[PDB]
Design a binder for this molecule. Structure first.
Ligand SMILES: [Zn+2]
Ligand SMILES: [Zn+2]
Ligand SMILES: [Zn+2]
Lengths: 56, 81, 82, 56, 46, 263, 65, 104
């Protein structure tokens, strides 16, 4: 019953979970072609990634 | 009927769960420890490590529709889950 | 505020926003008929709020009755509906 | 149907839910009052008596 | 007896006890209003 | 000095409007946050009720009394109750006043702040006085009373910080604005046809030369200039508010430095 | 009930303009906007706190007790 | 107990500092100050969870330059900037108040 073990539900061969609500909207703007991030901003964002390896 | 057992040689997810839980129960009951204690105060993690090293002394009796059964040692089985 | 949930200015709450009194009333009867039935509430020997009003009266039958109204202060909490 | 196929149980809690982006999928925030109400009869063993001793 | 009651429909006090019925001596009503406790009440303004 | 430069545009008793330059963004934002949050001041905290024959409920009156502004010049001369070694409260750490009245005439009586009476010893410290900005000096309207009523109570006020709770809020509004012309392109103005006409000009826009369409984007520019306007609640003079906020921020930084030295 | 002591968002005190506000409404027969402007309520976040208030205590006090 | 300092393991000359009862107000100030030091290789912060005033700051610097010393220098710079700000603002307030003595 652990969450990850049901990421892919055998109901329709589709992962039931996904990104929804604001998080989904944010992705489109972020990865958009017209998006650019300034240095100061990046360092803060990088530190949010818990699995960041420490490489710029 | 240990010869020509028609069941798979791999170990089942349900079997994984029950074996792990039972071994954890024994660990909690001051049962014999079979590997080194590496700070894993969690008994369930101890059982996980034991299964990783095939140090669990248990055998499973799988049943068939007709009531017949096969006995498989945990060290025989293949763990890929 | 991902789903329908909401962010509310905390300091605004502290300044009075959506503060609410909440009065509740308890009633009890001293006892049943006087036909050899006895009971009362004279401090016998051995939710959250304050006492606002205590009202004591009697029914048309002469049995004493008591009504207690207590009140409290709701302060908006996370999870409430709006 | 009312007592066997289902039944009132214990060691349970019910309340309202909410969102938390800062929380891992496999995680869930539990109200402190509930954590002080539900329990678990953990068994005393050499590897946990110290922590159990403090908890008691 | 004890200042336990106040005569609803009038500022007057009744201060009655057991076996004193509930009639208001000046109003005749059956309505008693418990005399407010003389102890002080603490609130944290917030 | 070589540090941040200041140029006040307007100055009154209620609000101060000025321009801060030669400073980064983080520092200005920190000044705003601090002036809002960590400005130690005085406020009614404990309310004890003797009698209340009024319409309103006790807790209601206590809550309202919590938010009446109070004089706090010498608040620094006052000590927090959480640190004062006295039980419950003491003059060295708290201010005691009372509120007594009762209906006298058939017309309503408006119980105001000016009816609050200072009791405890102020030791001459300019603190505890209710603040009245009213033209008639009547002060805030605590409550109302009918003829056959009575209200008496005792209030104790302690030094506290708005961060802990709003009632200690010393500063109401902080207008804060920079790069009104949007030279830095920190914003993408939403528009139907053209932002140049669909967006109004900020009053501060007249304090810089309007940007030239023919110049390329200055990608090296810093958000240098800043325009701020602080409206005090009257509890403290506005300049004193700015000074206290600056001091509190510097003191937090100094505390971090002291903790580093102890480390 | 009665005038709240402080504006919920601004924090600007408003529990002192009630009397002069009613005066300007009746004594000077001005509109709400002009009166509020005279009081210095230059933000709608604070103008609201008076403009929308409903004074009930006047009616509670009608009761004799 | 208010502060905790520990060494990072994913890179050298990198440290992680936990500040208790602290938040953006000073954290972003400190980060902005840090990123103006040439010897600093990396500097950022985050807030783990709004419910707690726990502030996490990671900083990596060049060899032979202790990140703790860089933090000390940043603090000193911030203190001096605040002092200069206060002095200038006090003088400006006096000069403008000379006019405000008549207009309050
Ligand atoms: Zn009566
Ligand atoms: Zn004291
Ligand atoms: Zn407002």
């Amino acid at each position: 019953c652990a969450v990850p073990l049901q990421i892919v539900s055998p109901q329709s061969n589709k992962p039931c979970m996904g990104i929804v609500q604001d998080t989904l909207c944010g992705i489109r703007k972020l990865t958009l072609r017209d998006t650019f991030i300034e240095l100061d901003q990046v360092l803060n964002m990088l530190y949010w990634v818990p699995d960041w390896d420490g490489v710029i | 009927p240990k010869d020509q057992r028609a069941t798979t040689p791999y170990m089942t997810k349900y079997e994984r769960a029950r074996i792990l839980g039972t071994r954890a129960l024994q660990i909690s009951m001051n049962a014999p420890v079979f590997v080194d204690l590496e700070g894993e105060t969690d008994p369930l993690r101890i059982a996980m490590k034991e299964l990783a090293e095939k140090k669990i002394p248990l055998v499973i009796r799988r049943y068939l529709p007709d009531g017949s059964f096969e006995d498989w040692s945990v060290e025989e089985l293949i763990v890929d889950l | 505020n991902q789903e329908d949930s909401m962010i509310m200015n905390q300091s605004s709450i502290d300044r009075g926003l959506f503060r609410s009194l909440f009065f509740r009333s308890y009633m009890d009867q001293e006892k049943k008929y006087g036909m050899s039935i006895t009971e009362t509430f004279e401090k016998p020997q051995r939710e959250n709020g304050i006492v606002d009003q205590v009202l004591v009266t009697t029914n048309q039958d002469g049995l004493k009755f008591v009504k207690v109204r207590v009140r409290t202060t709701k302060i908006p909490q996370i999870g409430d509906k709006f | 149907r009312g007592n066997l196929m289902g039944k009132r149980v214990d060691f349970s809690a019910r309340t309202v839910i909410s969102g938390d982006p800062n929380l891992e999928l496999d995680q869930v925030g539990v109200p402190k009052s509930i954590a002080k109400t539900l329990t678990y009869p953990e068994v005393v063993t050499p590897y946990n008596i110290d922590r159990l001793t403090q908890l008691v | 007896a004890t200042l336990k009651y106040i005569c609803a429909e009038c500022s007057s006090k009744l201060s009655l006890s057991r076996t004193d019925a509930v009639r208001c001596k000046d109003c005749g009503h059956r309505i008693l209003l418990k005399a407010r406790t003389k102890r002080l009440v603490q609130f944290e303004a917030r | 000095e070589e540090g941040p430069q200041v140029k006040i545009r307007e100055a009154s008793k209620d609000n101060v409007d000025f321009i801060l330059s030669n400073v980064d963004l983080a520092m200005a934002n920190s000044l705003r946050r601090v002036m809002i949050a960590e400005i130690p001041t005085l406020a009614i905290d404990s309310v004890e009720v003797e009698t209340n024959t009024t319409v309103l409920a006790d807790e209601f009156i206590a809550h309202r009394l919590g938010l009446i502004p109070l004089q706090s010049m010498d608040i620094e001369q006052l000590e927090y109750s959480r640190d004062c070694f006295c039980e419950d409260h003491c003059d060295k750490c708290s201010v005691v006043l009372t509120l007594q009245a009762f209906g006298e005439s058939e017309s309503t009586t408006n119980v105001y702040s000016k009816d609050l009476v200072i009791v405890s010893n102020l030791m001459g410290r300019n603190i505890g006085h209710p603040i009245i900005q009213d033209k008639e000096g009547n002060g805030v309207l605590i409550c109302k009373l009918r003829k056959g009523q009575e209200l008496k109570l005792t209030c104790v006020a302690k030094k506290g910080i708005a961060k802990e709770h709003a009632k200690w809020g010393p500063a109401a509004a902080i207008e804060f604005e920079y790069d009104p012309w949007n030279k830095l392109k920190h914003t993408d103005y939403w528009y139907e046809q053209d932002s140049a006409k669909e967006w109004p000009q900020s009053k501060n826009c007249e304090y810089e030369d309007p940007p030239n369409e023919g110049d390329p984007f200055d990608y090296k520019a810093q958000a240098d200039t800043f325009y701020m306007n602080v409206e005090s609640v009257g509890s403290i003079p506005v300049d004193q508010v700015v000074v206290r906020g600056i001091d509190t921020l510097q003191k937090k930084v100094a505390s971090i430095l002291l903790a580093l030295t102890q480390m | 009930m009665i005038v709240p002591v402080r504006c919920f968002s601004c924090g600007k005190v408003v529990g002192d303009k009630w009397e002069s506000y009613l005066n300007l409404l009746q004594e000077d027969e001005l509109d709400e906007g002009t009166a509020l402007s005279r009081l210095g309520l230059k933000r709608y976040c604070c103008r609201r706190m008076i403009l929308t208030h409903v004074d009930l205590i006047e009616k509670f006090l009608r009761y004799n007790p | 107990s208010k502060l905790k300092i520990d060494p990072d393991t994913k890179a050298p000359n990198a440290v992680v500092i936990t500040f208790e009862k602290e938040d953006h107000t000073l954290g972003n100030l400190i980060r902005a100050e840090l990123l103006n030091d040439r010897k600093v290789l990396f500097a950022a912060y985050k807030v783990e969870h709004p419910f707690f005033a726990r502030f996490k700051l990671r900083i990596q610097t060049t060899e032979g330059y202790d990140p703790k010393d860089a933090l000390k220098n940043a603090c000193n710079s911030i203190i001096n900037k605040l002092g200069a700000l206060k002095t200038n603002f006090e003088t400006e307030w006096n000069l403008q108040t000379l006019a405000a003595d008549d207009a309050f």
